Design a protein around this ligand. Structure first.
Ligand SMILES: CCCCCCCCCCCCCCCCCC(=O)OC[C@H](COP(=O)([O-])OCC(O)COP(=O)([O-])OC[C@@H](COC(=O)CCCCCCCCCCCCCCCCC)OC(=O)CCCCCCCCCCCCCCCCC)OC(=O)CCCCCCCCCCCCCCCCC
Ligand SMILES: CCCCCCCCCCCCCCCCCC(=O)OC[C@H](COP(=O)([O-])OCC(O)COP(=O)([O-])OC[C@@H](COC(=O)CCCCCCCCCCCCCCCCC)OC(=O)CCCCCCCCCCCCCCCCC)OC(=O)CCCCCCCCCCCCCCCCC
Ligand code: HEA
Ligand code: HEA
Ligand SMILES: CCCCCCCCCCCCCCCCCC(=O)OC[C@H](COP(=O)(O)OC[C@H](N)C(=O)O)OC(=O)CCCCCCCCCCCCCCCCC
Ligand SMILES: CCCCCCCCCCCCCCCCCC(=O)OC[C@H](COP(=O)([O-])OCC[N+](C)(C)C)OC(=O)CCCCCCCCCCCCCCCCC
Ligand SMILES: CCCCCCCCCCCCCCCCCC(=O)OC[C@H](COP(=O)([O-])OCC[N+](C)(C)C)OC(=O)CCCCCCCCCCCCCCCCC
Ligand SMILES: CCCCCCCCCCCCCCCCCC(=O)OC[C@H](COP(=O)([O-])OCC[N+](C)(C)C)OC(=O)CCCCCCCCCCCCCCCCC
Ligand SMILES: CCCCCCCCCCCCCCCCCC(=O)OC[C@H](COP(=O)([O-])OCC[N+](C)(C)C)OC(=O)CCCCCCCCCCCCCCCCC
Ligand SMILES: [Cu+2]
Lengths: 53, 211, 674, 50, 50, 318, 50
């Protein structure tokens, strides 16, 4: 639920850069899994969705 | 931080009186960290798809129908609140704690499920409330929900209940003819002694006594 | 060293007391004093569950009364039945659907969807939530309350003599005029500081000249001299005599009633017809509900205009359809709340000041009151219905993992529906004698509201096709909502036929129309939204079994309860009558059966919440982090992760060969062997 | 009187209502013997066929 | 109902929905012909009765 | 409501003695393995308490029953204490009913429809139960130790083969007849609480159900279920402490916990088990109470209604 | 079959009749209050379950 895919590419600068395809939600941040584990479950329930405003 | 010592009474392995929830076989919410940062699902092979390479192995055929049994993976158990710790994490110090949000994300208020018996009320809310509005309050009146009993012979007065007269109205000449017309159903009771006894086919209970 | 404290049980008790006090403080600071929009929305949802149970109980009272003719429930109390009907309508419109939708879903989703830290006025959000309960209580208990609180067998003559102070008016003459007071004391005592009750029975005892009929509980004044209660105990249920007849009068105060949720004048606006009491309660509670609605839409609309995320300030096509619908309905409520408040304030003035705003004798007109209320009226129902369109337009694309048919066109359809809502208020006033110009205008603008709704139906149908369908529980509720909305919409369009409306106004045909629209479609959409946000609302996965039971019993119950009402409306069954011709009892019984099926469905919904909180399982989104398969690479990623997840789930379940072997060789009961 | 709990039986005065034929009214044929006989007959026939 | 219930679940030939935007312009006008016919019928019958 | 009592026919002293003894013997025979399981459950958590969480709090009566049956004795292995429990139960009932009948006949109201209030009847029943429990404390002590010696180590078992055998062994080993009344105060408190926590709630719910639903037949049984629940809630801590004091061996070495009295037992239960430790075996105790009360009330109602009909009371007086 | 129709299916039917015989219907309609039979049928099923 953090990143659905990983990718390694080369930009015009010749750098081996990493691109992380994230997991998305359809217009509803409520349906978005705001988690920080490499899993698929919705373990975290944040009372304050924007913690730092 | 920190934690208390070890007590074998709290250890399911040692204390056999602790019943095991088989739906929490591989999940231990007391070890959960907030935010959740532990990986518990990765690539799994050799269940039905071998991890080796037999794509062009003419001597080997793959039969996934022979899937060997493995330990069942239960659905993830939700976190359980650590009350005191929670009551120590969201606690506020009045007039000595600055009104600000900390930089660390661990200050986020996470929802951990608690006791279940409370939701028992939520399970019975449509029942109890309805009872509260029909039984406790006796709405609309006392006699609606009680088991139905007809009044006795000529009670409370012959005006409201002229049963005796009705008896005569069914035993007089005219009344008999009326029954012959078929537009008036037969008499539904009998006056025995000073009591009124309803017939079985009437479909009503017997009148209560004047205690 | 070793510590031998004599109070170890007492140390445990001290820890328990500290825990209880800390938990009290934590609960107060987290769920009562909080400004957190999520917690306020959850509290709104639970309060709305309570109020929905109250409305369901009122509807149960109505259906028990209407089950068969002869007034089996209220036993001829037409005023009480009308009060119950009015309370059901008012708390179902203003204290179930409006609280659920606006409070719960808005306070939970506007900070999410719009992207704002809490709301513009967290104080106003808390204020609205905590002022809802008083209006709920006032509008829901008018069926239990009336100034004629005593029953027909309560002998008011036992206690009301203690009320009359005109009995002692003589002594009031000489309190400031002592001059003749002594002369006043030389009179003959007849009833001075004494009560005499006339004979209530014929007693033939010539030995006694006077018979005492003092109430049995008033004889020992000592027992009454230190009791700090009124003398009503001597009059409350002190006689065994009863009259179980429908025709007897259980009120004796024919004016003490209400005029329905649509305040009809002069019936509403005169003490001569509606006495002081429940009607005034309703009027002032509508004033309070208007104030609460003002607070709610102010707080919610200032949030989106000011606290919106930088990219969604003006692009409403990007927000979820439930949020678009909520904002449109909030604007509509902003327009109509002043009109409703003015109407009810005028009604209150007419009732208690005799301003004669709706008395035709010297200038007034009840038609003005009808115009004002229905100018508020129809936009209120359009406020109620539109958010369910958002619920279905969110749930259907989610499970179908495809874009909706035409979000721009659906938004413009609901907006033109909102526009037309302000010019069709008169289709509720066809028969009141409006001018034919106005009546034709209302009819022609009402018939064209079928144009936007069919756009919604077509867009839902085309959203259902050509996608990867992932059947969930919210999806089935969406299908139920679509089916229910198909019927109510076309029946309401039929109600715009002028001649049919003449034959169907104030009829159970109209009742079935707006109940299939509100009880069926709107509540089914609300349930679908609850299931769609079950993890966001409770944090745990919902219970499939009891959820399916609730879906089956609630959805079918609406049909079984409100199709017979269509049949009764075609048969000429007028509304707001507790007794009717006996040629309606069969379909009334069928409707009550459908209502009880709906009640069983509600029981199943509460049971599913209880079982889900028993389960305590984390919810996994069916999208697996890929809501849209915009690219075949996204499709491949989803397919790989889905196969891995299914393999992980299917562990501990024996393979196809083993299961087939067990099933084929299950039977082991044979008589003779070899 | 006999053990810890006393099943107090209380006499009550008469009550009645308008209607009598939509609540709980025990059927006359619903006796212990008759119910047992009919249920046993139906059950044994169904079980034999099953 | 047949196509959705028989060939649109994940296990029965789903579709890769690659569609960025809705591009309908006169679909509302074309679809609202049927409601227009209903309005015409209702108005005609009601007026003829009136 | 004090006018509503129905005491037109009142059984004689011989009638109450015989009926109580017979019906209570039947009830105790029917519901003894439940009390065996309950005593067994209260001993396996004598110092551990409830350590599971949420719906798993407590000890499973079916699990305890399955283990006791898997011991090998079968169903017949649940009546070892019933050999001695029946005599103690019958003696308690005899003494309690004698005292209750005497005090009631010396204080009952004159009118047949006037009965003593629930508070007065509770005082009478509490005194009777306390006296009878003090007099039957040795029998209850012998009964509990017979059940207790199954979940305890071989060194800690008393080895009582009956009631008189247990009485003699206690009077010899533990000092004398004064040692027969170990836990007598706990038994007195348990009986006092049990005798006052049933009739009150039972009549409460029975009359309220009648007011709500009239003269139906499920009213008394629903009220009995409610009364059993509340009596179990009120009595279980006292019964648990009585079991702990009964199972406490004289040798301090052979005890998981050593108690100097009812207060010490309560203190140690709160310290090690907690507040929830008093309600271990609640399901078993509540089921036993409900079944015992149902059997006794049903059989007594049948017999007394037959006797009233023979005596000639009107059908509304029965 | 004799054993199971005499003591199981027959017992189920007898308990159900003993518990649900007195719930009268409506004359010319339907038994609208069928919820009253739900706790009764649950008790009948629980009693004869084992
Ligand atoms: C409080 C003062 C009075 C306020 C006004 C009350 C007005 C009367 C209404 C009746 C009383 C309130 C009933 C609950 C309403 C819903 C509250 C809510 O959303 O709570 C969320 C909270 C979330 O907890 P969770 O989901 O378990 O996970 C978080 C953990 O608890 C971990 O989270 P935590 O660390 O916060 O845990 C602390 C607390 C969790 O906090 C609470 O439980 C909050 C309780 C106070 C809520 C105050 C706001 C209520 C707003 C109105 C809503 C109801 C309207 C009713 C209208 C009138 C009806 C007659 O949990 C406990 O302490 C466990 C036991 C709590 C008591 C039993 C449940 C209440 O609780 C629930 O969701 C349980 C809902 C149960 C509904 C029925 C309760 C009936 C109780 C009757 C006996 C009470 C003794
Ligand atoms: C939801 C919001 C909350 C409010 C809900 C109710 C609202 C309506 C209301 O209050 O109605 C009044 C209603 C009482 O009127 P009623 O039900 O018509 O009864 C009529 C008379 O009162 C006459 O009633 P009664 O006196 O006949 O009923 C009491 C009777 C029947 O009572 C019952 O059936 C239920 C209570 C059972 C008591 C025995 C077990 C006690 C267990 C522990 C305590 C729990 O119980 C007894 O006679 C007691 C016999 C057993 C004695 C036990 C002796 C040992 C005690 C210590 C044991 C220690 C064990 C551990 C060591 O309920 C209340 O007053 C209770 C709620 C009050 C709420 C407002 C005040 C809150 C203050 C804080
Ligand atoms: C949320 C509630 C809600 C909604 C959405 C509506 C929607 C509509 N309503 Fe009404 N209405 C009420 C709630 C609602 N209504 C209430 C509560 C009352 C009574 C107030 C009272 O007096 O107490 C009322 C009263 C009312 C009357 C007065 C009846 C009478 O008193 O005489 C009329 C008639 O003009 C009317 C018309 C309409 C029309 C034409 C629509 C249109 O918007 C609906 C059009 C929608 C569609 C057309 C979509 C259906 C799609 C199809 C494709 C159908 C075709 C399908 C088949 C034939 C299978 N409504
Ligand atoms: C949205 C409003 C709404 C809802 C939901 C309902 C629901 C029902 N209504 Fe009613 N009704 C009205 C609005 C509503 N009604 C109005 C405005 C009137 C006119 C008043 C007037 O005539 O003056 C009316 C009038 C009315 C009458 C008129 C009586 C008469 O005129 O003779 C009848 C009788 O058949 C009736 C029946 C029912 C029934 C059987 C239901 C059943 O559907 C009830 C089912 C119960 C629910 C739908 C509640 C859901 C339960 C929950 C607890 C939800 C809470 C949970 C969450 C979702 C979080 N209604
Ligand atoms: C309504 C009446 C209350 C009904 C039940 C109340 C308690 C519910 C279940 C329960 O037991 O909670 C548990 C606590 C109190 O138990 P405990 O002995 O400390 O258990 C921990 C034990 N020491 C152990 O080993 O695990 O319970 C608590 O945490 C506090 C109890 C307060 C409930 C009502 C107070 C108002
Ligand atoms: C103070 C704290 C709260 C206290 C709350 C106290 C009440 C608790 C809630 C009730 C508990 C269960 C009691 C069941 C007893 C049934 C006994 C009986 O035979 O009753 C006959 C009654 C009436 O049957 P009837 O239909 O034959 O009688 C109608 C009336 N006459 C006789 C005139 C025709 O049926 C019920 O009560 C059915 C109960 C079903 C289970 C639901 C319990 C609540 C019922 C509320 C009223 C009915 C609503 C129905 C739909 C409910 C949907 C949610
Ligand atoms: C609800 C029951 C419905 C029954 C429906 C069907 C009825 C018809 C068929 C009945 C078959 C079973 C009865 C057979 C009777 C004849 C055999 C017999 O009695 O043999 C002597 C039996 C033999 O028992 P045994 O166990 O020694 O068996 C000998 C074989 N060994 C030793 C190898 C196991 O003796 C007894 O049963 C003595 C005790 C008397 C009966 C006690 C009944 C207790 C009931 C449960 C109470 C609660 C327990 C706890 C529950 C959980 C906690 C709450
Ligand atoms: C040894 C002697 C022990 C005596 C113990 C106290 C009296 C008996 C128990 C109390 C009782 O019966 O209460 C019923 C009484 C019944 O009251 P009542 O008799 O007035 O009846 C109420 C019901 N009406 C009026 C409808 C008929 O209830 C209470 O007292 C209510 C409070 C709970 C009990 C408080 C005392 C508990 C015991 C404390 C022991 C120490
Ligand atoms: C008062 C103390 C707190 C409430 C009771 C706590 C407790 O022991 O609960 C577990 C006990 C468990 O009883 P138990 O010992 O029968 O446990 C069996 C429970 N199962 C089978 C589900 C695991 O529950 C009760 O005592 C419930 C009634 C409580 C009455 C007082 C409130
Ligand atoms: Cu309208």
């Amino acid at each position: 639920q953090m990143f659905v895919a990983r990718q390694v590419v080369t930009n015009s600068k010749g750098e081996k850069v990493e691109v992380l395809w994230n997991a998305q939600c359809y217009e509803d941040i409520a349906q978005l899994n705001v988690g920080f584990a490499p899993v698929l479950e919705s373990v975290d329930y944040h009372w304050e969705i924007f913690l730092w405003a | 931080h920190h934690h208390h010592e070890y007590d074998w009474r709290d250890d399911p392995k040692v204390n056999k009186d602790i019943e095991e929830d088989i739906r929490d076989r591989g999940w231990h919410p007391e070890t959960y960290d907030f935010p959740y940062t532990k990986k518990h699902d990765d690539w799994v092979f050799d269940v039905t798809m071998p991890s080796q390479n037999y794509q062009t192995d003419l001597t080997v055929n793959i039969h996934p129908e022979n899937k060997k049994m493995h330990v069942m993976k239960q659905v993830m158990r939700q976190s359980y609140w650590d009350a005191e710790h929670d009551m120590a994490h969201e606690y506020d110090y009045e007039s000595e704690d600055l009104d600000f949000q900390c930089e660390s994300f661990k200050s986020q208020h996470f929802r951990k499920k608690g006791p279940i018996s409370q939701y028992l009320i939520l399970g019975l809310l449509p029942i109890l409330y309805f009872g509260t509005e029909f039984f406790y309050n006796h709405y609309p009146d006392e006699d609606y929900w009680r088991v139905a009993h007809p009044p006795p012979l000529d009670y409370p007065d012959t005006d409201d209940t002229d049963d005796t007269e009705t008896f005569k109205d069914y035993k007089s000449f005219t009344g008999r003819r009326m029954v012959d017309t078929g537009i008036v159903d037969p008499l539904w009771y009998d006056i025995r002694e000073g009591k009124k006894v309803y017939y079985d086919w009437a479909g009503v209970n017997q009148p209560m006594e004047d205690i | 060293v070793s510590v031998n404290n004599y109070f170890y049980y007492l140390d445990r008790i001290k820890k328990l007391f500290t825990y209880l006090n800390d938990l009290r403080k934590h609960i107060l600071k987290k769920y009562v004093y909080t400004i957190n929009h999520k917690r306020i929305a959850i509290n709104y949802l639970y309060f709305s569950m309570v109020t929905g149970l109250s409305g369901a109980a009122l509807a149960t009272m109505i259906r028990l009364e209407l089950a068969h003719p002869g007034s089996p429930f209220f036993k001829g109390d037409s005023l009480r039945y009308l009060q119950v009907v009015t309370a059901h309508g008012l708390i179902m419109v203003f204290f179930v659907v409006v609280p659920i939708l606006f409070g719960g879903f808005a306070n939970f989703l506007i900070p999410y969807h719009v992207g704002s830290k809490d709301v513009a006025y967290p104080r106003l959000n808390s204020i609205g939530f905590w002022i809802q309960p008083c209006g709920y209580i006032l509008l829901a208990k008018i069926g239990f309350l009336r100034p004629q609180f005593w029953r027909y067998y309560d002998k008011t003559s036992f206690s009301f003599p203690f009320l009359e102070k005109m009995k002692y008016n003589q002594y009031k003459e000489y309190k400031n005029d002592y001059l003749f007071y002594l002369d006043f004391l030389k009179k003959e005592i007849t009833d001075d500081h004494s009560f005499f009750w006339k004979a209530r029975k014929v007693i033939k005892l010539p030995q006694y000249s006077v018979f005492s009929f003092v109430p049995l509980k008033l004889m020992m004044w000592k027992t009454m001299i230190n009791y700090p209660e009124s003398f009503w105990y001597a009059a409350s249920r002190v006689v065994q005599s009863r009259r179980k007849k429908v025709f007897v009068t259980k009120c004796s105060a024919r004016t003490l009633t209400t005029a329905g949720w649509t305040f009809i004048t002069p019936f509403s606006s005169n003490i001569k017809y509606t006495g002081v009491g429940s009607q005034d309660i309703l009027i002032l509670s509508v004033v309070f509900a208007g104030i609460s609605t003002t607070i709610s839409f102010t707080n919610l609309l200032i949030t989106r205009r000011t606290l919106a995320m930088p990219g969604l300030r003006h692009r409403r096509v990007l927000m979820p359809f439930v949020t678009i619908s909520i904002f449109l309905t909030l604007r509509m409520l902003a327009t109509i709340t002043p009109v409703l408040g003015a109407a009810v304030i005028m009604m209150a003035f007419d009732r208690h000041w005799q301003t004669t705003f709706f008395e035709y004798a010297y200038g007034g007109d009840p038609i003005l009151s009808q115009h004002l209320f229905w100018f508020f009226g129809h936009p209120e129902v359009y406020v109620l219905i539109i958010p369910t369109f958002g619920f279905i337009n969110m749930i259907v694309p989610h499970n179908n993992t495809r874009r909706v048919a035409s979000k721009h066109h659906m938004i413009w359809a609901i907006y033109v529906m909102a526009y037309m809502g302000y010019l069709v208020w008169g289709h509720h006033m066809y028969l009141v004698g409006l001018d034919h110009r106005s009546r034709t205008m209302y009819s022609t603008i009402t018939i064209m509201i079928s144009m936007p709704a069919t756009i919604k139906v077509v867009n839902w149908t085309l959203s259902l096709v050509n996608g990867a369908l992932k059947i969930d529980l919210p999806f089935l509720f969406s299908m139920s909502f679509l089916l229910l909305f198909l019927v109510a919409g076309f029946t309401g369009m039929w109600l715009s036929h002028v001649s049919l409306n003449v034959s169907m106004h104030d009829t159970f045909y109209v009742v079935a129309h707006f109940h299939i629209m509100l009880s069926g479609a709107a509540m089914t959409g609300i349930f679908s939204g609850i299931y769609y946000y079950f993890n966001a609302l409770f944090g745990v996965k919902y219970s499939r079994m009891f959820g399916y039971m609730h879906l089956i019993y609630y959805s079918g119950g609406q049909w079984v309860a409100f199709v017979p009402l269509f049949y009764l409306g075609f048969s000429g069954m007028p509304r707001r009558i507790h007794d009717y011709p006996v040629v309606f009892m069969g379909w009334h019984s069928m409707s009550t059966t459908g209502h009880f099926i709906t009640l069983v469905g509600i029981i199943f919904f509460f049971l599913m919440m209880f079982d889900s909180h028993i389960e305590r399982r984390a919810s996994t989104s069916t999208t697996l982090g890929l809501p849209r398969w915009y690219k075949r690479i996204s499709y491949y990623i989803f397919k790989i992760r889905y196969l891995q997840h299914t393999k992980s789930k299917m562990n501990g379940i024996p393979g196809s060969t083993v299961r087939l072997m067990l099933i084929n060789r299950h039977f082991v009961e044979y008589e003779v062997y070899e | 009187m006999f053990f810890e709990l006393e099943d107090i039986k209380r006499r009550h005065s008469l009550y009645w209502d308008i209607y009598n034929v939509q609540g709980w009214v025990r059927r006359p044929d619903s006796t212990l013997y008759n119910n047992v006989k009919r249920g046993v007959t139906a059950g044994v026939v169904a079980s034999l066929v099953q | 109902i047949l196509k959705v219930a028989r060939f649109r679940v994940l296990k029965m030939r789903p579709k890769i929905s690659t569609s960025y935007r809705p591009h309908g312009k006169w679909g509302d006008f074309l679809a609202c012909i049927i409601p227009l016919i209903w309005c015409i019928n209702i108005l005609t019958n009601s007026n003829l009765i009136l | 409501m004090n006018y509503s009592y129905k005491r037109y026919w009142e059984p004689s002293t011989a009638e109450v003695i015989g009926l109580s003894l017979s019906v209570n013997t039947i009830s105790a025979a029917l519901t003894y393995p439940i009390e065996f399981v309950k005593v067994r459950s209260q001993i396996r958590t004598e110092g551990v308490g409830i350590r599971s969480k949420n719906l798993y709090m407590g000890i499973n009566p079916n699990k305890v029953f399955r283990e006791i049956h898997a011991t090998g004795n079968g169903l017949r292995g649940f009546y070892q204490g019933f050999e001695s429990h029946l005599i103690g139960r019958l003696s308690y009932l005899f003494i309690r009913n004698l005292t209750y009948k005497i005090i009631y006949d010396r204080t009952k109201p004159v009118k047949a429809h006037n009965d003593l209030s629930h508070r007065e009847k509770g005082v009478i029943a509490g005194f009777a139960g306390g006296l009878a429990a003090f007099l039957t404390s040795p029998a209850d002590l012998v009964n509990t130790r017979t059940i207790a010696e199954g979940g305890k180590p071989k060194e800690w078992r008393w080895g009582y083969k009956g009631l008189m055998d247990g009485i003699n062994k206690i009077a010899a080993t533990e000092g004398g007849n004064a040692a027969l009344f170990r836990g007598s105060y706990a038994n007195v408190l348990r009986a006092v609480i049990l005798n006052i926590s049933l009739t009150g709630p039972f009549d409460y719910l029975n009359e309220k159900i009648w007011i709500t639903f009239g003269d139906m037949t499920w009213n008394k049984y629903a009220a009995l279920l409610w009364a059993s629940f509340w009596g179990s809630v009120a009595t279980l801590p006292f019964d648990n402490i009585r079991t702990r004091l009964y199972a406490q061996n004289a040798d301090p070495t052979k005890n998981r916990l050593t108690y100097s009295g009812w207060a010490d037992a309560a203190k140690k239960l709160i310290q090690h088990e907690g507040i929830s430790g008093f309600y271990v075996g609640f399901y078993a105790f509540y089921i036993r109470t409900f079944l015992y009360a149902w059997t006794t009330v049903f059989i007594t109602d049948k017999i007394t209604s037959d006797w009233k009909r023979k005596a000639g009371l009107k059908e509304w007086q029965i | 079959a004799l054993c199971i129709g005499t003591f199981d299916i027959g017992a189920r039917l007898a308990t159900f009749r003993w518990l649900n015989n007195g719930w009268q219907r409506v004359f010319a309609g339907f038994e609208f209050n069928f919820v009253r039979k739900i706790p009764t049928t649950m008790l009948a099923a629980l009693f004869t379950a084992p």
